[PDB]
Amino acid sequence: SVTAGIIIVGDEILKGHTQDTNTFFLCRTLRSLGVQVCRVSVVPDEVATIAAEVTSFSNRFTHVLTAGGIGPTHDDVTFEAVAQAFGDELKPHPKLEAATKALGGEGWEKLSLVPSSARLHYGTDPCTGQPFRFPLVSVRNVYLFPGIPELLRRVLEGMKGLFQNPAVQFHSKELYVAADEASIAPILAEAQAHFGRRLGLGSYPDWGSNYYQVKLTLDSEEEGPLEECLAYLTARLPQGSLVPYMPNAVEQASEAVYKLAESGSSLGKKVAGALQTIETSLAQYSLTQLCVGFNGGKDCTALLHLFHAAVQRKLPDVPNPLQILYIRSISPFPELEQFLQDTIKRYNLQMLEAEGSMKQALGELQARHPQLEAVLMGTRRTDPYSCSLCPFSPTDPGWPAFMRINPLLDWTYRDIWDFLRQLFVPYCILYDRGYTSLGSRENTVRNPAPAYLLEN
Amino acid sequence: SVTAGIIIVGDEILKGHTQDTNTFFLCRTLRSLGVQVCRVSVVPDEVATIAAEVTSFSNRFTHVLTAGGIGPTHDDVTFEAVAQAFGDELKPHPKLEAATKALGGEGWEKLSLVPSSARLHYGTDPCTGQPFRFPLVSVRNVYLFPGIPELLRRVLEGMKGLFQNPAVQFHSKELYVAADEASIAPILAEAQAHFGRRLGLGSYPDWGSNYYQVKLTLDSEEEGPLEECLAYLTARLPQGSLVPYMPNAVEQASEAVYKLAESGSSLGKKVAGALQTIETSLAQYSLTQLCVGFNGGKDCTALLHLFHAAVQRKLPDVPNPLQILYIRSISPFPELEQFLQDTIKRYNLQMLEAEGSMKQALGELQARHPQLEAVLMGTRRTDPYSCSLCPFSPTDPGWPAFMRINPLLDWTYRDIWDFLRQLFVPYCILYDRGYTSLGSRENTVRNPALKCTYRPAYLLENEEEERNS
């Protein structure tokens, strides 16, 4: 049981000028090394305050790690505070003097003025593989790191040996629960009691996903207790509470979709057909010549995901940035605003927004890009004009002439939903609230008393 | 003098599972309101520890703001901790009971079990305009916020009136100094003494810039002292320490480049000519047909900047990412690779990678991209082959068929460096370290002329000395 406390010295973080990113790194790294972090404290550049906090933490924890305040200016007073807390006196340390002298050493006198009882630790910068400029100063069980975030990460990585607890290795499991915290709290209490000291079970909500509301976290020093509690909980919790959620969209999406295609299942065959059409799309036109019609709904969501999967594997070496065509005609829904920005961010899309009917946007697009010659469409066999549609249907004479590709032409509503949910693809949350179609504000209603249970 | 302490509750934050973002929002918000935050504290889900910190912060500071631990599980124990801290007893507050009963209220009894001395503060959620689900719980000068960052931001926005200090207004301003921290340390000490408690002066280094090393920070309740200190320091500090640097190398570059072109100066004329060639390029081919040859160096940096300005002027609508072709030295420098990575995000470029001879990379490209037909080049007329070169030159017969466009043909080394620095365009750090020309690792060395512990590249006064390194 090796514990540690952290003291971050910085006026700026308290003021709000800059955000604190050192604390997350320090905590994560120390967790990996086998050290239990018990407290964190942000304090201003004041000698008395820093000295009090150092004294308390030193008495209470095995290791103490301070970040910031060892500069050459007047506001840098960590060394002085550490001197005070331990009744030491500040003295120029010859080796730090030599370090400053090897370089320019103008006005660096304060950088070598450290507590008399200090000890130096030399290490290797992981980025350069060469030794650091200055060694790490320690006093009793207090290690004085710099505040510069890049340098802090480098120095901690270089000197992490100093903190490794060999006796302890931490093992952790994550679980996604679709129920709110209130419903499962009793089961968690019972499980924690039954297991007691062996493992720590915690819970916290994370709000922005279609597949879980709460995240359970299991922690232990050994691997076994984690699975034992997994079994206990899978039993106690109602069946299906847990979700095997994976971040797929960005990278695994390519191979995950292809795997679903090669599987011998109905949905697998539908995916295989859509992907064959999309591959032909890539073979007739350059991607600079293709664009995906995206209104925000599911059909367009699935189309975009399939196009991404196909593009990646077909064209890994080329940058292949995705282009989409977005039409607004009615005052956007709030959920739609959020989803559209999120989607373009995830996929790194190119939005050429015309506002009106699709044909109008198509004219605008012909104007903006002379190379574009074809549009991918999420039209389907359930959508009217269904008998006339072909996988490749050319644009009407009046409209601006583009050749439309309909990979999802034979896909059915049930298939769209199976495909989206099985791979955990994100979609507009309104669908989860009982709306079967995303339309204008006057157009939208809920037919059920989720959307993915409606049969037709 | 309204002071505030902050207590962040949650084991997960400490273990490293998740990062804490509540603290930045709380600190920024409280400063905007006129409240000085004196401490922040992260504590585990333990009653004793939370209660100790609560007692301490309450006795010492005007406001105490707690985030987390008011959930319905057992590991959430803020209410009980506060009860302990003030010797109070937990008793259900009927209004919170009515709230929990209004909805299903399954397992929500713990959400209505608060200290007997609790006070409720009702508000309205700024996103929905609807009243909050639950009110903000207060005990003494201790305010119990939820832990979910989205919901906490909503709640703080709704009820921030509770903390507004009318007596105080904060003024803050930052300065960019091209000097090491040690050199200005004495001047900063003297200025701070001279101003005493009128104004608060801090300094911190910022590492990723070609134009400044340190950032000075002035904080006060009035504007006058800030301007006074600006004058004091501008006088005390050696000349040129202060720089009017602005991070508009991309958004405002469009207007700036053309402004410099319209100037009747040697450099202005050079920029106008390069831009004329580039505009002609855009008039001949579509952007899908163009790409910028970019090796990371100075010439390509300036070329990309000019090309960007021209594109944003003629086609402000066209969002297309500009395409660039990168050739990798048999042994690239790491710093140059990093600068190229930083650049691809700055300008949002699309990279058509290729290695080997220019001829080889072009052979691969015409396969990867058939639609592409022309390449912009940062070549300059140093050697005779380039003096023979023309602005629009096709590739030799052997090479693959592309049209090379050389807008920078007549530019001189001094002009390149002036164009980059005057507009504060970012460039590879290696040039500042004494390299005047970046080639493969085994061929290039810090330029000896620039040694004295090496001087920047943009001070070398002779253009011919750049060529030898």
CSV table of C-alpha atoms in Angstrom, one decimal, chain A residues 12-21 23-24 27-28 31 36-44 46 49 53 57 60 71-76 106-108 148 150-151 154 172 180-185 188-190 192 201-208 217-219 286 288-289 315-321 348 350-352 368-371, chain B residues 12-21 23-24 27-28 31 36-44 46 49 53 60 71-76 106-108 111 133 148 150-151 154 172 174 180-185 188-189 192 200-205 207 217-219 286 288-289 317-321 323 348 350-353 368-371:
chain,number,residue,atom,x,y,z
A,12,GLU,CA,-3.1,30.6,-13.3
A,13,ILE,CA,-5.1,27.4,-12.8
A,14,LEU,CA,-6.9,28.9,-9.8
A,15,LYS,CA,-7.7,32.0,-11.8
A,16,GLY,CA,-9.0,30.0,-14.7
A,17,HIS,CA,-6.5,31.5,-17.2
A,18,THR,CA,-5.3,28.0,-18.2
A,19,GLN,CA,-6.6,24.5,-17.7
A,20,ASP,CA,-4.8,21.9,-15.6
A,21,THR,CA,-3.6,18.9,-17.6
A,23,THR,CA,-3.0,16.3,-12.7
A,24,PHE,CA,-4.6,13.7,-15.1
A,27,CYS,CA,-2.6,10.4,-11.6
A,28,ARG,CA,-2.8,8.0,-14.6
A,31,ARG,CA,-1.7,4.4,-11.1
A,36,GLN,CA,-2.5,4.8,-4.8
A,37,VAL,CA,-3.1,8.5,-5.1
A,38,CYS,CA,-5.1,9.7,-2.1
A,39,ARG,CA,-5.3,13.5,-2.6
A,40,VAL,CA,-4.6,16.4,-4.9
A,41,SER,CA,-4.2,20.1,-4.1
A,42,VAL,CA,-3.9,23.3,-6.1
A,43,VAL,CA,-2.3,26.1,-4.2
A,44,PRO,CA,-1.1,29.7,-5.1
A,46,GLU,CA,2.7,31.5,-1.6
A,49,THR,CA,0.7,27.9,2.1
A,53,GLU,CA,0.6,21.6,2.4
A,57,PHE,CA,1.2,15.5,2.7
A,60,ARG,CA,0.5,11.5,5.5
A,71,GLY,CA,11.6,28.8,-12.0
A,72,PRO,CA,14.0,31.7,-11.8
A,73,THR,CA,11.5,34.5,-11.2
A,74,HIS,CA,10.2,35.9,-7.9
A,75,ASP,CA,6.8,34.1,-8.1
A,76,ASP,CA,8.7,30.7,-8.1
A,106,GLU,CA,22.7,34.2,-17.0
A,107,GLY,CA,20.5,34.9,-14.0
A,108,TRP,CA,20.1,31.2,-13.3
A,148,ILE,CA,5.7,23.0,-18.0
A,150,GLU,CA,5.5,18.8,-22.0
A,151,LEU,CA,8.6,18.8,-19.8
A,154,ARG,CA,8.9,13.8,-20.2
A,172,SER,CA,-9.2,-3.1,-13.8
A,180,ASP,CA,-29.6,4.6,-14.3
A,181,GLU,CA,-27.5,4.7,-11.1
A,182,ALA,CA,-30.6,4.7,-8.9
A,183,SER,CA,-31.9,1.3,-10.0
A,184,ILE,CA,-28.6,-0.7,-9.7
A,185,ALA,CA,-27.3,1.0,-6.6
A,188,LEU,CA,-23.9,-2.8,-6.3
A,189,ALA,CA,-24.1,-2.4,-2.5
A,190,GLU,CA,-24.8,-6.1,-2.0
A,192,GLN,CA,-19.5,-4.7,-2.6
A,201,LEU,CA,-16.6,-1.4,-7.3
A,202,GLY,CA,-17.5,2.1,-8.3
A,203,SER,CA,-20.0,3.8,-10.5
A,204,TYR,CA,-20.3,7.0,-12.5
A,205,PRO,CA,-22.6,8.3,-15.3
A,206,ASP,CA,-21.4,9.3,-18.7
A,207,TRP,CA,-24.2,11.0,-20.6
A,208,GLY,CA,-23.5,11.2,-24.4
A,217,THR,CA,-15.6,0.2,-12.7
A,218,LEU,CA,-14.0,-2.8,-11.0
A,219,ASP,CA,-10.6,-2.5,-9.4
A,286,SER,CA,-12.5,9.2,-57.9
A,288,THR,CA,-13.0,13.7,-55.3
A,289,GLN,CA,-15.9,12.9,-57.7
A,315,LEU,CA,-7.8,3.2,-50.2
A,316,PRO,CA,-5.5,3.1,-47.1
A,317,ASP,CA,-2.4,4.8,-48.5
A,318,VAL,CA,-4.3,7.8,-50.0
A,319,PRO,CA,-5.7,10.4,-47.5
A,320,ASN,CA,-9.2,9.9,-48.8
A,321,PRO,CA,-11.1,12.6,-46.8
A,348,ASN,CA,-13.7,14.7,-40.9
A,350,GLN,CA,-16.6,18.4,-46.0
A,351,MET,CA,-20.0,20.2,-45.6
A,352,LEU,CA,-21.1,22.2,-48.7
A,368,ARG,CA,-18.8,24.8,-56.2
A,369,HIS,CA,-17.0,21.7,-57.5
A,370,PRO,CA,-16.5,21.0,-61.2
A,371,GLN,CA,-15.1,17.6,-60.5
B,12,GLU,CA,-12.4,7.8,-10.2
B,13,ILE,CA,-10.8,11.3,-10.7
B,14,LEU,CA,-7.9,10.3,-8.5
B,15,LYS,CA,-7.3,6.9,-9.9
B,16,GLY,CA,-6.9,8.4,-13.4
B,17,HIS,CA,-9.9,6.7,-14.9
B,18,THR,CA,-11.3,10.1,-16.0
B,19,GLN,CA,-10.0,13.6,-16.1
B,20,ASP,CA,-11.5,16.5,-14.1
B,21,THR,CA,-13.0,19.3,-16.2
B,23,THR,CA,-12.4,22.7,-12.0
B,24,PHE,CA,-11.6,24.8,-15.1
B,27,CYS,CA,-12.5,28.7,-11.6
B,28,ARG,CA,-13.2,30.7,-14.8
B,31,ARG,CA,-13.3,34.8,-11.6
B,36,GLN,CA,-11.1,35.0,-5.8
B,37,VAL,CA,-10.4,31.3,-5.6
B,38,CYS,CA,-7.7,30.5,-3.1
B,39,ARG,CA,-7.6,26.7,-3.1
B,40,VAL,CA,-8.8,23.6,-5.0
B,41,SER,CA,-8.9,20.1,-3.4
B,42,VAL,CA,-9.5,16.6,-4.8
B,43,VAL,CA,-10.6,14.1,-2.2
B,44,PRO,CA,-11.8,10.4,-2.3
B,46,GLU,CA,-14.7,9.0,2.1
B,49,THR,CA,-11.8,13.3,4.6
B,53,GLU,CA,-11.9,19.7,4.1
B,60,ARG,CA,-11.6,30.1,6.2
B,71,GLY,CA,-25.7,10.6,-6.3
B,72,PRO,CA,-28.0,7.8,-5.2
B,73,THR,CA,-25.4,5.1,-4.7
B,74,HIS,CA,-23.5,4.2,-1.5
B,75,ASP,CA,-20.1,5.4,-2.8
B,76,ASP,CA,-21.6,8.9,-3.1
B,106,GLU,CA,-37.3,4.3,-7.5
B,107,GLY,CA,-34.2,4.2,-5.3
B,108,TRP,CA,-34.2,8.0,-5.1
B,111,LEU,CA,-31.5,12.0,-3.1
B,133,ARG,CA,-35.0,18.6,-11.9
B,148,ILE,CA,-21.6,15.2,-14.2
B,150,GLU,CA,-22.5,18.8,-18.6
B,151,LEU,CA,-25.1,19.0,-15.8
B,154,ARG,CA,-25.8,23.8,-16.7
B,172,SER,CA,-6.5,40.6,-16.9
B,174,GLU,CA,-1.2,39.1,-21.2
B,180,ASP,CA,14.4,34.0,-21.4
B,181,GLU,CA,12.6,34.1,-18.1
B,182,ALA,CA,15.8,34.8,-16.2
B,183,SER,CA,16.6,38.0,-18.1
B,184,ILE,CA,13.4,39.7,-17.2
B,185,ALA,CA,13.2,38.2,-13.7
B,188,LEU,CA,9.6,41.8,-13.0
B,189,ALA,CA,10.7,41.8,-9.4
B,192,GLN,CA,6.1,44.1,-8.7
B,200,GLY,CA,-0.4,41.2,-9.6
B,201,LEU,CA,2.4,40.2,-12.0
B,202,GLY,CA,3.2,36.7,-13.1
B,203,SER,CA,5.2,35.0,-15.8
B,204,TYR,CA,5.4,31.7,-17.5
B,205,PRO,CA,7.3,30.2,-20.5
B,207,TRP,CA,7.4,26.7,-25.7
B,217,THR,CA,0.4,38.3,-17.0
B,218,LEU,CA,-1.0,41.3,-15.3
B,219,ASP,CA,-4.1,41.0,-13.1
B,286,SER,CA,-9.3,23.5,-60.5
B,288,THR,CA,-8.7,19.2,-57.4
B,289,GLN,CA,-6.1,19.5,-60.1
B,317,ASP,CA,-16.8,29.6,-50.4
B,318,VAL,CA,-14.8,26.6,-51.6
B,319,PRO,CA,-14.0,24.6,-48.4
B,320,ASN,CA,-11.9,22.0,-50.2
B,321,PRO,CA,-8.8,21.0,-48.3
B,323,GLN,CA,-3.7,19.0,-51.5
B,348,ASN,CA,-6.1,21.4,-42.8
B,350,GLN,CA,-4.6,16.6,-47.5
B,351,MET,CA,-1.3,14.8,-47.9
B,352,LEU,CA,-0.4,12.6,-50.9
B,353,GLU,CA,2.6,10.7,-49.4
B,368,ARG,CA,-3.3,7.4,-56.7
B,369,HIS,CA,-4.8,10.6,-58.1
B,370,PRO,CA,-5.5,10.7,-61.8
B,371,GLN,CA,-7.4,14.0,-61.6
